[PDB]
Structure 1
Amino acid sequence: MTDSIMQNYNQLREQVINGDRRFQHKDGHLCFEGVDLDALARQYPTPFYVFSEPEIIRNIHEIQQAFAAHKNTKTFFASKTCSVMGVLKAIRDAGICAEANSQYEVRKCLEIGFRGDQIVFNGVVKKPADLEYAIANDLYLINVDSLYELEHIDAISRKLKKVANVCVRVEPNVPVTAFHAKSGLDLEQAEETCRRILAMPYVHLRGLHMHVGDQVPESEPFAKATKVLVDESRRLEEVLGIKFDLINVGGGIPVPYKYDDENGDPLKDNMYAGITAQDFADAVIREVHKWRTDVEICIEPGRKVTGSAAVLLTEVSCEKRKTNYDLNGNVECHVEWKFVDAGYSVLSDSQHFDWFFYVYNASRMTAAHDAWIKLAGPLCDGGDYFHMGVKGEEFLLPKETHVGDIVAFLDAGAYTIESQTVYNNRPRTGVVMIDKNGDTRLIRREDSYEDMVKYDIYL
């Protein structure tokens, strides 16, 4: 019933401001770590993202606590999730390490203060220049994704006379893997890869690596895939006469994007998180301890560290009513369009990956969200409106919603910044940080006009 959906959404709204560790209300406005978000959006031009260092810390503590029973566990934040320097600084200051996915990501992590022995470099295309930069900076791990890439690692480590620390990435076939997974080696190739590495003077084999996927909604895939990696690690220790330093089990811990679990099925709608960080650790640690309790476990969480820790703030900038009439002139329906100053060039996954984010009127957060509306962006593009609504393509906002109100998208902290574009020559957004003491500062400027022509060469 449309009634039950509206009631349910407003119960969720009341829970945001009365039972959520991240949020409060003051003067009718949504607050984030004590910061009035209506007022904040009057200090900085919209649209912009605002991150919470407190929530990043909470997410890291959840992950670390999940692995308490295995003392030798190292956590590497997957920086492709978000690499604004102030966010990386917060993750460093919380005490964990960094995973990097290109040459420039390695360099950024070094610049912001991660030591080489706190960085893992992963990739399917690591060119000689990428490998030379990584080996020169003594990284904790460089993953081996293919036999072709291993030839370069051998040649370059010999040239630099510096040891390359490596893990061999294996992708288990856990019921297509050949046809759908570009990453890693087949299980059948792990032994010959490790044998080749053991003969190289300046390459050090540290263990095996896998990564099963993103926003994973059940625990058995981590468990079955971890068992495969563990069984092969055990067998290679015996066959090759060695003892591995570590096993790297990757990332994939999901984040709740819809919270009413009683009303969802994570296997049909993975906006419902199927599992928790504790379920992930329970799967990994149990399978590893069938082999060794002392070996180091490496994990590479991305989404879980930052996903819940940002909000997108965007101003209602225009409004219109459209009306469909039949042939006799009678009204078929009214459509209430609200236009915000952020579109899919700002929030890419709302279009390209059918991703749901909670939407509320932050200026009227204690008011009933009782009007069905369609929410559009500012791009000159018929497709730039938000399709992932509360009911179909329709959202709920207070009927009193006014141009100038601030709209908030929740859970906007993962894969939302580096994926922005300058389509229509609208600038990529500023980013604000709420630090752990509750104070705010700008950590990324909005693209300026100059920024957008400076790459071009012209008279």
Structure 2
Amino acid sequence: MTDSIMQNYNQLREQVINGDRRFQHKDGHLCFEGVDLDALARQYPTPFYVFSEPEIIRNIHEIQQAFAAHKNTKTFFASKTCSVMGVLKAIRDAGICAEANSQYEVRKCLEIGFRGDQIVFNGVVKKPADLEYAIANDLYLINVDSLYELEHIDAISRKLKKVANVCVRVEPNVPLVTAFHAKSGLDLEQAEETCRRILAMPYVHLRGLHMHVGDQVPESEPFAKATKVLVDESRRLEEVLGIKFDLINVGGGIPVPYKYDDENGDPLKDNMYAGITAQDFADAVIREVHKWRTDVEICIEPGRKVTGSAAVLLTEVSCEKRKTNYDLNGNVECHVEWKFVDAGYSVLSDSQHFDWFFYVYNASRMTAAHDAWIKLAGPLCDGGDYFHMGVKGEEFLLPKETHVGDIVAFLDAGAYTIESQTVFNNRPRTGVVMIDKNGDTRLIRREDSYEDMVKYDIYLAA
């Protein structure tokens, strides 16, 4: 099976450089939107992430084209996915809106140019200061996640004499037990009284209901079933309360392919295979909404799908070693070829914490057979800081000729990879480079400096 696994992985490698809209090859090197990534990693210090504005645009087009059957669709990028200002700017320039998950995310979205009417603010803990900031900035939506929080929305909107526009988050029990496993939202049974309360509030304007199914969802059925619950309650409440809702917000969760050989993958057992497309998500949602109204606005909150495929992590092979296991008589049992790169799980956190797979290739030797089994380690002083989600078990494939100094690329590294970095071991969080629409590159986030990292501390100087 290993030889066939090796054959299959090299077929995937060839597809990257001859059949992928993002990539080419030049001088033996992987190129991204025409940019030679080996050369790029000689210009900027590794490790760093490189984002593609062209690919973000293609992803947004996929999402928007998926919703062509429903004209009144509004798309809010879930900025917890990635909020580097230059990424947010590319997303704003590509024509969609923004969902924010904290006061500082709201502020960043406003500062990069999203208008208040292009921002949704969601959360389970929206303290009075957070709500005051959001209400004062006339956000399109602030979700209502609990009755406790709603009391603060009422009080603060009254204090500011400013209308707060809200959607009530309802998390349906769609059979694993919503009460035990879903911290967010209200129960369906609480929706009516919550909406009745809001109608009576002078400065709180009820716009619709909200749900969010989850992340990297491998089937369309959960979106259909959950949307139907919220549509049925929306229809019922319009009748009971004598109102017409502005909108329904169905959240995010469109998956991204992290493994591409779907013929060999089962998305229900390995959700690195994308089980559905944006079109499947849209078909499920739109079909359920149109059983109630065709004119109502549908709000969607895609995160991962906007940026996931649109970045690469570039990391230099910085050390190598061979480790050999010997039996008790001194005979070799096996050899392990370790390659150390300058990025570990403080840089690429989900590879460790969420068992996330990313394709790994030698970008400096992209046209060479990846014919050697290796283990790939990071630089942290932690026995667990190596990449466990290999091609076969914990083993990766690289050219046997791989050399210290080569650039390794992790593909599909654009979602949930920047804000989740740490300064563990006082290794810096990475710089970030952007490829713009013209194929030109610029730095959009600096690498943390020494002074950056000590300046939060308060201590007598030396």
Cα distance, 1:327 vs structure 2: 1.4
Cα distance, 1:294 vs structure 2: 0.4
Cα distance, 1:111 vs structure 2: 0.2
Q: Distance in 2 between matches of 1:69 and 1:325?
A: 64
Q: Distance in 1 between matches of 2:282 and 2:276?
A: 11
Q: Distance in 2 between matches of 1:62 and 1:266?
A: 20
Q: In structure 1, the residue corresponding to 2:111 is in which secondary structure? A: helix
Q: Distance in 2 between matches of 1:155 and 1:324?
A: 68
Cα distance, 1:149 vs structure 2: 0.3
In the alignment, which residue of structure 2 is the partner of 1:350? 351
Q: Distance in 2 between matches of 1:236 and 1:382?
A: 56
Determine what percentage of the aligned residue pairs are the same residue: 100
In the alignment, which residue of structure 2 is the partner of 1:295? 296
Q: In structure 2, the residue corresponding to 1:380 is in which secondary structure? A: coil
Q: Distance in 2 between matches of 1:127 and 1:321?
A: 53
Cα distance, 1:48 vs structure 2: 0.2
Q: Distance in 2 between matches of 1:387 and 1:78?
A: 28
In the alignment, which residue of structure 1 is the partner of 2:240? 239
User: Deviation per CA, 1:356-412, whole angstroms, max 9, x where unpaired?
Assistant: 000000000000000000000000111100000000000000000000000000000
Q: Distance in 1 between matches of 2:262 and 2:315?
A: 28
User: Deviation per CA, 1:122-173, whole angstroms, max 9, x where unpaired?
Assistant: 0000000000000000000000000000000000000000000000000000
Q: Distance in 2 between matches of 1:201 and 1:174?
A: 34
Q: In structure 1, the residue corresponding to 2:338 is in which secondary structure? A: strand
Cα distance, 1:316 vs structure 2: 0.3
User: Deviation per CA, 1:287-337, whole angstroms, max 9, x where unpaired?
Assistant: 000000000000000000000000000000000011111111111001100
Alignment of 1:36-435 (within 5 A): 36-175=36-175, 176-435=177-436
In the alignment, which residue of structure 1 is the partner of 2:14? 14
Q: Distance in 1 between matches of 2:337 and 2:43?
A: 29
Q: Distance in 2 between matches of 1:44 and 1:329?
A: 45
Cα distance, 1:261 vs structure 2: 0.2
Q: Distance in 2 between matches of 1:434 and 1:318?
A: 29
| Cα RMSD after superposing both structures | 0.3
Q: In structure 2, the residue corresponding to 1:5 is in which secondary structure? A: helix
Q: Distance in 1 between matches of 2:328 and 2:194?
A: 72
Q: In structure 1, the residue corresponding to 2:139 is in which secondary structure? A: coil
Normalization by structure 2: what TM-score? 0.99
User: Deviation per CA, 1:426-455, whole angstroms, max 9, x where unpaired?
Assistant: 000000000011000000000000000000
Q: Distance in 2 between matches of 1:30 and 1:124?
A: 43
Cα distance, 1:116 vs structure 2: 0.3
Q: Distance in 2 between matches of 1:452 and 1:348?
A: 19
User: Deviation per CA, 1:223-279, whole angstroms, max 9, x where unpaired?
Assistant: 000000000000000000000000000000000000000001000000000000000
Q: In structure 2, the residue corresponding to 1:143 is in which secondary structure? A: strand
Q: In structure 2, the residue corresponding to 1:167 is in which secondary structure? A: strand
Q: Distance in 1 between matches of 2:303 and 2:401?
A: 38
Q: In structure 2, the residue corresponding to 1:247 is in which secondary structure? A: strand
Q: Distance in 2 between matches of 1:442 and 1:236?
A: 50
Q: Distance in 1 between matches of 2:80 and 2:389?
A: 24
Q: Distance in 2 between matches of 1:405 and 1:440?
A: 21
Cα distance, 1:51 vs structure 2: 0.1
Q: Distance in 1 between matches of 2:286 and 2:391?
A: 38
Q: Distance in 1 between matches of 2:230 and 2:325?
A: 59
Q: In structure 2, the residue corresponding to 1:49 is in which secondary structure? A: strand
- Where has structure 1 moved over 3 Å in runs of 4 or more? none
Q: Distance in 1 between matches of 2:213 and 2:447?
A: 35
How many residues of Structure 1 are paired with residues of Structure 2 in the alignment? Answer: 459
Q: In structure 1, the residue corresponding to 2:3 is in which secondary structure? A: helix
Q: Distance in 2 between matches of 1:80 and 1:168?
A: 20
Q: Distance in 2 between matches of 1:220 and 1:345?
A: 35
Q: In structure 2, the residue corresponding to 1:148 is in which secondary structure? A: helix
Q: Distance in 2 between matches of 1:197 and 1:376?
A: 54
Q: Distance in 1 between matches of 2:310 and 2:57?
A: 9
Q: Distance in 2 between matches of 1:154 and 1:2?
A: 62
Cα distance, 1:282 vs structure 2: 0.2
Q: In structure 2, the residue corresponding to 1:204 is in which secondary structure? A: strand
Q: In structure 1, the residue corresponding to 2:12 is in which secondary structure? A: helix
Q: Distance in 2 between matches of 1:30 and 1:249?
A: 38
Normalization by structure 1: what TM-score? 1.00
Q: Distance in 1 between matches of 2:312 and 2:220?
A: 28
Q: Distance in 2 between matches of 1:324 and 1:139?
A: 61
Q: In structure 1, the residue corresponding to 2:110 is in which secondary structure? A: helix
Q: Distance in 2 between matches of 1:337 and 1:62?
A: 39
Q: Distance in 2 between matches of 1:59 and 1:41?
A: 25
Q: Distance in 2 between matches of 1:52 and 1:272?
A: 22
Q: Distance in 2 between matches of 1:326 and 1:230?
A: 65
Q: Distance in 2 between matches of 1:203 and 1:338?
A: 58
Cα distance, 1:340 vs structure 2: 0.3
Q: Distance in 2 between matches of 1:353 and 1:246?
A: 34
Q: Distance in 2 between matches of 1:205 and 1:444?
A: 39
Cα distance, 1:79 vs structure 2: 0.1
Q: In structure 2, the residue corresponding to 1:74 is in which secondary structure? A: strand
Does 323-332 or 225-234 show the bigger shift? 323-332
Q: Distance in 1 between matches of 2:261 and 2:230?
A: 35
Q: Distance in 2 between matches of 1:22 and 1:190?
A: 45
Q: Distance in 2 between matches of 1:408 and 1:58?
A: 21
Any gaps of 5 or more consecutive residues in structure 1?
Answer: none
Q: Distance in 2 between matches of 1:43 and 1:70?
A: 45
Cα distance, 1:347 vs structure 2: 0.2
Q: In structure 1, the residue corresponding to 2:319 is in which secondary structure? A: strand
Q: Distance in 2 between matches of 1:435 and 1:428?
A: 22
Q: Distance in 2 between matches of 1:22 and 1:66?
A: 21
Q: Distance in 1 between matches of 2:142 and 2:368?
A: 52
Q: Distance in 1 between matches of 2:439 and 2:68?
A: 29
Q: Distance in 2 between matches of 1:27 and 1:228?
A: 55
Q: Distance in 2 between matches of 1:327 and 1:342?
A: 36
